[PDB]
Amino acid sequence: GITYDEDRKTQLIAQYESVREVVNAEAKNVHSKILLLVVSKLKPASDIQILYDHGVREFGENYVQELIEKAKLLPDDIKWHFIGGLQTNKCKDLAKVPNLYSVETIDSLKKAKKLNESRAKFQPDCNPILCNVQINTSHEDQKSGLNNEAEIFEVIDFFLSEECKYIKLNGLMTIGSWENRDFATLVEWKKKIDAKFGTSLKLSMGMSADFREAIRQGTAEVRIGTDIFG
Length: 230
Ligand SMILES: *Cc1c(COP(=O)(O)O)cnc(C)c1O
Fold this sequence. Notes:
Blueprint lengths: L5 H22 L7 E5 L5 H10 L3 E4 L2 H10 L5 E4 L8 H5 L4 E7 L2 H14 L6 E6 L14 H11 L7 E7 L7 H17 L4 E3 L6 H6 L4 E4 L1 H4 L1
Parallel strand pairs: 1-2, 1-8, 2-3, 3-4, 4-5, 5-6, 6-7
Protein name: Pyridoxal phosphate homeostasis protein
Subcellular location: Cytoplasm; Nucleus
Keywords: Acetylation, Cytoplasm, Nucleus, Pyridoxal phosphate
């Protein structure tokens, strides 16, 4: 497939395994496996091939066109996770990727309906896209994420409806803020929702600077790039 240098291979795998060892060590230190989503945004496809060949399957991309271009160049069994800003007009585009495993940035009912809509038309055959609801856990104003309980509840209601058959509600997601109060707020959102809808939501929180704490607060998935591709 994509050709890569041997010195970079040895270095990428080393840095990755070291990140994965700390994630596993942190997890094993609590009261069962956490996903290490490898955020390859802006990284070349050769780097992904390096890790792919190493056994890695789940990579996170933030840009729609980049993910699509990347998906066509690399193996079909990669489990792409779209973790960037989602515009309703790009849903149709994303839905076309067969191996689009997950979309963690659904932050409106309009978007959920459009992705489910698009997925039905272009890849009804393919497995339902696993989805996370992005919530603004910061107590500040943030360009993305939901903060309104009524609107959040309305998004969850649709996911559990019979009409939503091509995208599956998996959990909650947050970019945090800039002990962790943000992860704490996400944890509280999962309880209020699990209680009201009878769900057992999966949490996606924790990045390069705070994945350890996220791991301590119950995360089911951490998204790390910098620590792995440096
Ligand atoms: C880029 C990004 C990450 C990862 O942070 P790193 O310092 O690169 O580990 C995780 N989640 C989202 C939504 C991102 O934009």
